[PDB]
Structure formats: C-alpha cells, structure tokens
C-alpha cells in the first residue's frame, strides 16, 4: 500500500542483478506486485554470489 517509487538500483551504484522479472524493465511500475518481503542483514561482502 505504498507509492513504490522504483528510483533505486539503477540509482547509486554497486548493488546486484535481478534475474527475476518479466518484460520491459525500466522503473518496473505498471505491474505493482502484491507483497514486499524486505529482508535485512550483513554479509562478509566477498561472497555476493552465495
């Protein structure tokens, strides 16, 4: 029930890929999904691909 505001990832830098989307990426929008399972933690940082 939020504004979404897909103005990140393409923003700043670093980050990771997605590999889990549909078609026409951009700021996603259009389809606004159903849930946001926001998970937070800290990793060693070298793994990344793990």
């Amino acid at each position: 029930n939020c504004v979404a505001d897909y103005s990140v990832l393409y923003n700043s830098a670093s980050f990771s890929t997605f590999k889990c989307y549909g078609v026409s990426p951009t700021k996603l929008n259009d389809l606004c999904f159903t849930n946001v399972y926001a998970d937070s933690f800290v990793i060693r940082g070298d793994e990344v691909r793990q």
């Binding site: 990832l9 393409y10 923003n11 830098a13 990426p25 951009t26 700021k27």
Partner: protein, 49 residues
Amino acid sequence: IAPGQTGKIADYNYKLPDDFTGCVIAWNSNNLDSKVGGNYNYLYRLFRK
C-alpha cells in the same frame, strides 16, 4: 554499458542503447591523461530530464 542496464548514466547522462550486438569500446585507465591540474574540461551532464 551492457544489455538490461537502466542507470541514469546509461541513458540520462550519456545515451547508449543496451541492445547493441556489435562492439563498443569504453575503457577506464588514466595513463596518458594523468591531469592533476584541475581536469574539469570533461563535463558530466548530470541534469537530465
């Protein structure tokens, strides 16, 4: 500079389509430049609308 990218520099700062299947050479190495006396001649064009 790769397919699927959506960063501002990808299109906002500098326009470069990600569907190219040829060859684009955009390296990153100071080497020759080595300009320590305020090398501001190369603009950025951050303000894009």
